[PDB]
Design a protein around this nucleic acid. Structure first.
Ligand SMILES: [Mg+2]
Ligand SMILES: [Zn+2]
Lengths: 49, 49, 96, 292, 88, 1126
RNA sequence: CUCGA
DNA sequence: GCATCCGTGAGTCGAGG
DNA sequence: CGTGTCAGAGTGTCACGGATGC
């Protein structure tokens, strides 16, 4: 779920310490599941083959 | 049984294969790849071969 | 060895088929000798059973030349062919 | 479901007694090889430790039968012989597996056939091939859509037997034996000869993962200096290939049929449209669309 | 100490037969340029590994006859190989 | 100024916030953990001021726990005390050269206590050569620097979980009691409203079966658990009742097959959970229980054991949580909340460092020796026993050897550049023994937790399969003797900032609220706003009154790692590319010469000094003599210390570690000052790359999606040239038919190939060697019975007798070339200890000078990576108004997608640093430069600046600097106020139609060069078993046409290509040879045969009692070059 | 084990 | 007659240990 | 060779289906 507080700054302006920290939570789990989502994808592909 | 043993559940397919004493007619893409025959598709079918 | 053969048959291997395949029983549990690198007789690498370590070279050392092609050595029981047989000659253990 | 098992034994003419073994076959030694190590000691396949444990317990049972040992020792020994053959065929199937040194489970015979590391997927559905190489890919705008730039040092080794052939034809080398030494030493004659060899001889380019069939496309090689592969900027969409350190593999078709399949079926110019949707892929994509 | 299935142990390799295939091709070329007597004597001493007297018994010739044929047929091949630049 | 503490170059920082606390020792994690283990005086003195009373080192702690050893009677006793070390056996570099281990002999004082003799013999007993940690924080095992990585593990304690059932959709609860060692114990409430307990993963018994076995009556159980109906249903559904009944029920499920005696189960149920022999909660494990349950929370920590009271309080804690309760006090215990634990929170997740990881291995090794002692006591006589006779140190030293030799924590040190090495020592790894399996790590262990603030970096982590599982310790973070990570904070009393700094653990931080570092603060200390951005427990961010702020952050960059803190304008880059930016800085290659970046962060200085690859002056003095070989310092007192330079040494990863003196003859140098710097260092700062003149524009497609165009100036002037060193090795053994000998005489080789060899058969120093050149001439005797028929004929037709040896010489691998720089020879004849069976050993060091090539991977600090697409001549490059061509052309399209504007902001500030600036002082200070320090109002060309992370330059000041950039020597300002400049197309001459952003960007050469990554193979070695080509470049193997790739062939219908790949080009034993002949003959390609790999498959199915046969069209079985005998 | 796409 | 538990599966390629 | 106290392993995946079992 989304955090009840948004990152108001833009990357041109410059995020604060806390603004940057809360952003990384979604960025890391974004890369993390991208390895798992490709695994179930490549598995579904070889089943279809 | 050769196309199946190379997909999933290798032992479960090989056990039921020797019990029923199944014989595999080597006419299929996955089979001919293993034994080294031309695959029965594309330039491998008897029409173009 | 042409590449057109129709069927590939699989079935249960009779305990009598296992002996039909085997070129001898693996009696001793030893592997080789850890000085001479020569495999022990009736072991898991026995040359009398599976085949010669080197081509045309027997275990006892009597037959080391190619002219004696196909001779079953009397003193060590090893045949004298190429070491290519050591990839295809089956053994067997006779269970009590 | 019982009939499925029972009916099969009846018709086939093979007895169900085969499920109980009186003798176990031993796989030839070269498939369970024992290699020596540079430290003096040895290292053997796990199948040798499994076959050895069956032999050890089977020979101890032979002693108990001769000695008339109590039925409690013979029965408890026979049980261990069953677990040994169970470990040799499929260690870990029943109960806790036979651990080797370091609590590592030993690989049984049936482990040689299962999964990504098994015989089927690792060594039968896919193989390592001769006449192949790999290097970093670098964009080359000057290349035509049917062309690719591969390094000179790559081509010399890739076409090594073909270069040796011409080195003896044009009499740059006396015999084919010395012709091989010329390519390994890179005598200046090979670079002029190598160009004649790769003439209109297509090559295959591939980038993992091979998602669709356009993940492998054929090109006409052009000898370029440097050590990077020069790829056409329009096939980047098909390969999903960016240029931030990617590598591609090269495969050289040898037979006449294989080159013909590369020239007609797999050529990049003959595969502009996506087979999934019919819409083009080799089209202006990044800088090209901004320029237009 | 070690198990091959266990990681950290190098797998065995066998070199390619390229050098052996090329020599076999050149040997087969120089063999055709030999008389039927000489070619049928070197192929019975080095390809079949027989003794000097064994070849004499098969070919129905004298003992020293096999010695003399081998002596020349070897030099005859050295002539054919050196004329093609085969490294000593 | 920035970092005015060691005497470093003056880098001018855009810092608006003062730094209250200076960066600690970045190597403390590896240093402090090992000093405690060996009880060094520095650790002891540190513990003395820490308030400790009688502190005990890690080695002493093992000996005191071990003491004393006694048999069942008590007539014999052995004890240990006073562990001490003698001097080190060999210096650091000598171990690297001779491939030995850096260690010091460990001495202890042992004595035998015999109650029956009234006399004791005490003496000094040598225990073993103990691996010592270098000053750089590394170990040397067999001549290779290794790093013991700190491990993140589940802290010992009692943990509660709120799981949701699958079938009944009711909220379940479970408990785990994880000891520091021994058996585990987990209670749970299933979906049937009943309570049970698994003991050592065995079968789950009803929870009252355990209570009855401990001596609790069935009545006293109802008195304690009567307030819940789920426990009344447990004692009723229970099967067996009786103290001597449920005690045997546990015995038969725990140790089956044994006779159950009332006193054989009374013995183990005490030894497995209440005797310190087979069970132990560490000083942190006991403490984590006494707070979670709320008992003994005031007693001094003396119980190193689980107690029966805890087991009841645990079951009491569980049952209340099941029915919605939120508060509980144990009978006679303080109040504590009832909730579930995160297990990802850094107060429940523990970090064990070098000392503990070694201590546990020592403890296990001592226990193996202890069993030898008790066995040796009851065998030998009770009057000729000395401490030397009872002690067999074989299992002790073999336990520390097995650890450093093989462990997920003992890792081959990352030695690409100094930063990579410093980061490796500060790594925190979840993987390894005692932690977790990679196959059991879900998507929740890997992501960022709010308790990681200021402790573990949220950015620095690999992007491969180890993402999240491996982190880097935050800058100011440290570890307490318990195992948790502390981070400093400034204590705010009543809205008043104080210079008092206190370190708080993870759970200590939640009991307060802390203000963000960039809080507006009065000069006295009072917050400017009543409501300030403040962090609260459970990761909540909100405004809060100024009278509520208890603490505040030390520095803005407190949350990032050292490598992360080196990215200028990091606050303008997204976390995705920021991760790659820090991870690729560790992949930089040390160049021939090194330049410090114009745009810095200030961290570059301390990162280089603390890494330990420079040469810092220990004591103040003057430089007596300086050479390329060594530097001598004459101290004030009169003593001389000489520092030797490491010149052209091969790193772990083949990079060139080369130190160079900085000072000159007769220079006054202060203590702790850099007198010489090594790889990737310039005047003491991390110089991971070079300052390149960059233009942001597409250029004829040569920089198409992330490709890079370089000016050939970087090649002509060795700007991106780097030295690389490879190690080659070969040995001469004893064979069955003789002995391998290293000799210049090699059969059938000209005097021309052997021309670069000396009389021994070794290549000579300085000789340039291409691939295939002989390095060491070794011949091995081959038997006569091993000869080909053609080879025996070929031997006869060349008349060369006495050539029973074949060529096994050491040749240069494919893709290698360089100058031979060093030779090391080891001979059994010359007292050199070789492995048994070896007579000579030779190592040849080859160094290549690698200029930047097409395809070499460059990258910046903002995750902007790319391979070199084209190296244009200097005239082709787009050049500025005064003819100076740019050095690198970065594509514009690859900028706004990645969200890494930091490279654009660095390019702007980079130019201002290159040119300099002068702000209009007349009519006051302008309104954009009011916040800037006075040192920034004027800058000289090629000035150095610091942009600290989350602080540093703001866009208001950066925009103003571009407006006042200094003119060139001709007096013309090349870049506009926008930051763009007018470029000229060097290929045509026409100026480019629009201005282009131009400046200076710090570019690094990453260790991903085409010189290593190019490979090709016609034929070569084949794997003996499968008869398929080998894998990898090093083994000269072929590429793997995988499973997915075969689907592509079939999708094309390319049948012959598919059959060709899997047969004649792969594992067809006869087809591959006949194809090679068919090519050299000019004939056609023959017909593919049967793969040998398929032959092996059949022979393997046969070994599993499967009768596989090949049938022809008629049906007759056909053999495959084999028969069958009986 | 560690890393590259 | 049904809840339990066992066994199955979980991207491809490459470099160094 | 003969053998006479006892000392004692790893533990953070999960979805899904169907044979297994009180
Ligand atoms: Mg890419
Ligand atoms: Zn013999």
């Amino acid at each position: 779920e989304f955090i009840p507080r948004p990152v108001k700054s833009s990357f041109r302006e410059g995020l604060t310490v806390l603004e940057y920290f809360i952003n990384t939570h979604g960025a890391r789990k974004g890369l993390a599941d991208t390895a798992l989502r490709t695994a179930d994808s490549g598995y579904l592909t070889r089943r279809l083959v | 049984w050769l196309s199946a043993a190379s997909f999933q559940e290798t032992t479960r397919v090989l056990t039921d294969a020797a019990i029923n004493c199944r014989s595999d007619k080597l006419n299929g893409l996955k089979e001919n790849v293993i034994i080294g025959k031309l695959i029965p598709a594309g330039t491998g079918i008897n029409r173009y071969r | 060895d042409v590449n057109f053969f129709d069927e590939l048959r699989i079935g249960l291997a009779t305990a009598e088929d296992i002996r039909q395949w085997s070129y001898g029983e693996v009696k001793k549990p030893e592997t080789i000798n850890y000085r001479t690198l020569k495999p022990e007789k009736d072991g898991l690498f026995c040359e009398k059973i599976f085949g010669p370590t080197r081509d045309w070279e027997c275990y006892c050392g009597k037959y080391k030349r190619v002219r004696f092609k196909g001779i079953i050595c009397e003193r060590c029981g090893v045949e004298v062919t190429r070491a290519k047989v050591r990839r295809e000659r089956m053994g067997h253990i006779e269970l009590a | 479901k019982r009939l499925k098992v029972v009916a099969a034994f009846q018709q086939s003419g093979n007895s169900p007694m085969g499920m109980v073994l009186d003798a176990v076959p031993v796989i030839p030694p070269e498939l369970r090889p024992m290699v020596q190590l540079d430290g003096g000691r040895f290292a053997t396949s796990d199948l040798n430790d499994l076959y050895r444990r069956v032999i050890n317990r089977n020979n101890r049972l032979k002693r108990l039968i001769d000695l008339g040992a109590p039925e409690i020792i013979v029965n408890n020994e026979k049980r261990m012989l069953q677990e040994s053959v169970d470990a040799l065929f499929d260690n870990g199937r029943r109960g806790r597996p036979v651990t080797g040194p370091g609590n590592r489970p030993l690989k049984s015979l049936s482990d040689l056939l299962k999964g990504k590391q098994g015989r089927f997927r690792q060594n039968l559905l896919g193989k390592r091939v001769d006449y192949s190489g790999r290097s970093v890919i670098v964009v080359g705008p000057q290349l035509k859509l049917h062309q690719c730039g591969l390094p000179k040092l790559m081509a010399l080794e890739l076409f090594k037997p073909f270069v040796m052939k011409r080195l003896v034809d044009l009499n740059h080398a006396q015999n084919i034996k010395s012709a091989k030494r010329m390519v390994e030493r890179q005598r200046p004659q090979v670079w002029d000869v190598l160009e004649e060899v790769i003439a209109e001889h297509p090559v295959l380019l591939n980038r993992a993962p091979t998602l669709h069939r356009l993940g492998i496309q054929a090109f006409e090689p052009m000898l370029v200096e440097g050590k990077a592969i020069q790829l056409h900027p329009l096939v980047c969409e098909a390969f999903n290939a960016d240029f931030d350190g990617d590598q591609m593999a090269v495969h050289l078709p040898l037979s006449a049929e294989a080159q013909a399949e590369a020239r007609i079926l797999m050529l990049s110019s003959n595969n502009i449209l996506s087979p999934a949707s019919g819409r083009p892929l080799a089209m202006p994509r990044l800088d090209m669309v901004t320029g237009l | 100490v070690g198990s091959t299935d266990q990681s950290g142990t190098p797998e065995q390799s066998t070199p390619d037969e390229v050098n052996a295939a090329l020599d076999r091709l050149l040997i087969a070329d120089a063999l055709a340029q030999l008389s039927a007597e000489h070619r049928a004597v070197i192929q019975r001493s080095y390809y079949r590994g027989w003794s000097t007297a064994q070849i004499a018994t098969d070919l129905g010739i004298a003992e020293g006859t096999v010695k003399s044929r081998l002596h020349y047929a070897v030099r005859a091949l050295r002539l054919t190989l050196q004329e093609l630049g085969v490294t000593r | 100024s920035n970092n005015s503490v060691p005497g470093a170059p003056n880098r001018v920082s855009f810092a608006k916030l003062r730094e209250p606390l200076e960066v600690p020792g970045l190597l403390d994690v590896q240093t402090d953990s090992f000093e405690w283990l060996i009880g060094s005086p520095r650790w002891r003195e540190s513990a003395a001021e820490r308030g400790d009373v009688n502190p005990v080192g890690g080695l002493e702690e093992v000996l005191y726990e071990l003491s004393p050893i006694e048999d069942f009677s008590g007539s014999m006793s052995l004890s240990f005390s006073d562990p001490r070390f003698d001097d080190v056996k060999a210096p650091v570099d000598e171990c690297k050269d001779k491939d030995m281990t850096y260690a010091a002999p460990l001495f202890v004082t042992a004595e035998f206590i015999n109650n029956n003799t009234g006399e004791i013999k005490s003496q000094t007993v040598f225990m073993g050569d103990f691996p010592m940690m270098t000053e750089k924080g590394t170990f040397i095992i067999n001549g290779t620097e290794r790093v013991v990585v700190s491990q993140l593990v589940r802290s010992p304690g009692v943990y509660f979980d709120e799981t949701i059932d699958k079938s009944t959709d009711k909220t379940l609860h479970s408990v785990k009691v994880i000891p520091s060692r021994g058996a585990w114990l987990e209670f749970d409430v299933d979906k049937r409203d009943t309570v049970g307990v698994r003991i050592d993963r065995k079968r789950r018994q009803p929870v009252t079966v355990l209570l009855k076995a401990l001596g609790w009556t069935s009545e006293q159980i109802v008195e304690r658990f009567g307030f819940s109906e789920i426990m009344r249903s447990t004692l009723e559904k229970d099967n067996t009742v009786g103290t001597d009944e449920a005690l045997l029920d546990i015995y038969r499920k725990l140790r089956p097959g044994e006779p159950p005696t009332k006193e054989s189960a009374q013995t183990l149920l005490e030894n497995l959970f209440f005797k310190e022999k087979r069970y132990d909660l560490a000083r942190v494990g006991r403490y984590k229980v006494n707070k979670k349950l709320g008992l003994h929370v005031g007693e001094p920590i003396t119980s190193s054991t689980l107690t029966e009271e805890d087991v009841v309080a645990t079951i009491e804690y569980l049952v209340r949580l099941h029915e919605g309760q939120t508060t509980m006090t144990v009978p006679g215990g303080v109040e504590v909340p009832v909730e579930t634990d995160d297990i990802d929170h850094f107060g429940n997740r523990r970090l064990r460092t070098v000392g503990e990881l070694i201590q546990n291995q020592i403890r296990v090794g001592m226990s193996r020796m202890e069993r030898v002692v008790r066995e040796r006591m009851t065998t030998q006589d009770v009057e000729a026993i000395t401490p030397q006779t009872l002690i067999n140190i074989r299992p002790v030293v073999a336990a520390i050897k097995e650890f450093f030799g093989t462990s997920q924590l003992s890792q081959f040190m990352d030695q690409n550049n100094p930063l990579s090495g410093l980061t490796h020592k500060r790594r925190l790894s979840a993987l390894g023994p005692g932690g977790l399996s990679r196959e059991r790590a879900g998507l929740e262990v890997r992501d960022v937790h709010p308790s990681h603030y200021g402790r573990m970096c949220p950015i620095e982590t690999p992007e491969g399969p180890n993402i999240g599982l491996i982190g880097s310790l935050s800058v100011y973070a440290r570890v307490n003797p318990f195992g948790f990570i502390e981070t400093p904070y400034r204590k705010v009393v009543d809205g008043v900032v104080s210079d008092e700094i206190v370190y708080l653990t993870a759970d200590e931080e939640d009991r307060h609220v802390v203000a963000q570092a960039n809080s507006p603060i009065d000069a006295d200390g009072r917050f400017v706003e009543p409501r300030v951005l403040v962090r609260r427990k459970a990761g909540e961010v909100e405004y809060v009154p100024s009278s509520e702020v208890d603490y505040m952050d030390v520095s803005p960059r407190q949350m990032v790692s050292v490598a992360t803190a080196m990215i200028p304008f990091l606050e303008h880059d997204d976390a995705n590319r920021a991760l790659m930016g820090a991870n690729m800085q560790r992949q930089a290659v040390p160049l021939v010469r090194s330049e410090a970046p114009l745009v810095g962060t200030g961290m570059e200085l301390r990162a280089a000094i603390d890494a330990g690859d420079v040469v810092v002056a220990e004591e103040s003095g003057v430089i007596e003599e300086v050479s390329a070989d060594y530097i001598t310092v004459m101290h004030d007192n009169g003593t001389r210390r000489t520092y030797r330079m490491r010149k052209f040494a091969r790193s772990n990863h083949g990079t060139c570690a080369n130190q160079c003196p900085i000072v000159d003859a007769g220079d006054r140098v202060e203590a702790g000052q850099v007198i010489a710097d090594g790889p990737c260092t310039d005047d003491g700062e991390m110089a991971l790359g070079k300052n390149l003149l960059v233009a942001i524009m597409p250029w004829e497609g040569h920089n198409y999606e992330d490709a890079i165009i370089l000016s050939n100036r970087l090649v002509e002037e060795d700007v991106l040239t780097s030295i690389h060193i490879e190690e080659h090795e070969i040995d001469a053994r004893d064979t069955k038919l003789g002995a391998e000998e290293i000799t210049r005489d090699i059969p059938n080789i000209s005097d021309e190939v052997l021309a670069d060899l000396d009389e021994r058969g070794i290549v000579r120093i300085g000789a340039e060697v291409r691939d295939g050149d002989i390095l060491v001439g070794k011949v091995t005797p081959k038997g006569e019975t091993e000869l080909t028929p053609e080879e025996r004929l070929l031997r006869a037709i060349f008349g060369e007798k006495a050539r029973e040896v074949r060529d096994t010489s050491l040749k240069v691998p494919h893709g290698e070339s360089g100058k031979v720089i060093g030779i090391r020879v080891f001979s059994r004849e010359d007292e050199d200890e070789l492995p048994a069976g070896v007579n000579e050993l030779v190592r040849v060091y080859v160094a290549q000078k690698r200029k930047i090539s097409d395809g070499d991977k460059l990258a910046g600090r903002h995750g902007n990576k790319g391979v070199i697409g084209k190296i244009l001549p200097v005239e082709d490059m787009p050049f500025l108004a005064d003819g100076t061509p740019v050095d690198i052309i970065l594509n514009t399209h690859g900028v706004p997608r990645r969200m890494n504007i930091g490279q654009i902001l660095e390019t702007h500030l980079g130019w201002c640093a290159h040119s300099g600036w002068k702000v209009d002082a007349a009519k006051g200070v302008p309104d954009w430069a009011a916040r800037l320090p006075d040192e920034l109002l004027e800058a000289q060309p090629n000035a150095i600046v610091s942009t600290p992370v989350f602080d540093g330059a703001q866009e208001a000041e950066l925009q103003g600097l571009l407006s006042c950039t200094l003119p060139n020597r001709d007096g013309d300002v090349l870049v506009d106020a926008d930051g763009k400049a007018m470029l000229f197309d060097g290929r045509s001459g026409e100026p480019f139609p629009y201005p282009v952003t131009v400046g200076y960007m710090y570019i690094m050469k990453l260790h991903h060069l085409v010189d290593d990554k190019i490979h090709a193979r016609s034929t070569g070695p084949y794997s003996m078993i499968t008869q398929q080509p080998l894998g990898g470049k090093a083994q000269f193997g072929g590429q793997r046409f995988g499973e997915m790739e075969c689907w592509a062939m079939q999708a094309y219908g390319a049948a012959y290509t598919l059959q060709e790949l899997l047969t004649i080009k792969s594992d067809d034993t006869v087809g591959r040879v006949k194809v090679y002949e068919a090519i050299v003959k000019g004939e056609n390609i023959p017909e593919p045969g049967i793969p040998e790999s398929f032959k092996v498959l059949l022979k393997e199915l046969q070994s599993l009692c499967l009768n596989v046969e090949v049938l022809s069209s008629d049906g007759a079985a056909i053999e495959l070059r084999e028969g069958e005998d009986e």
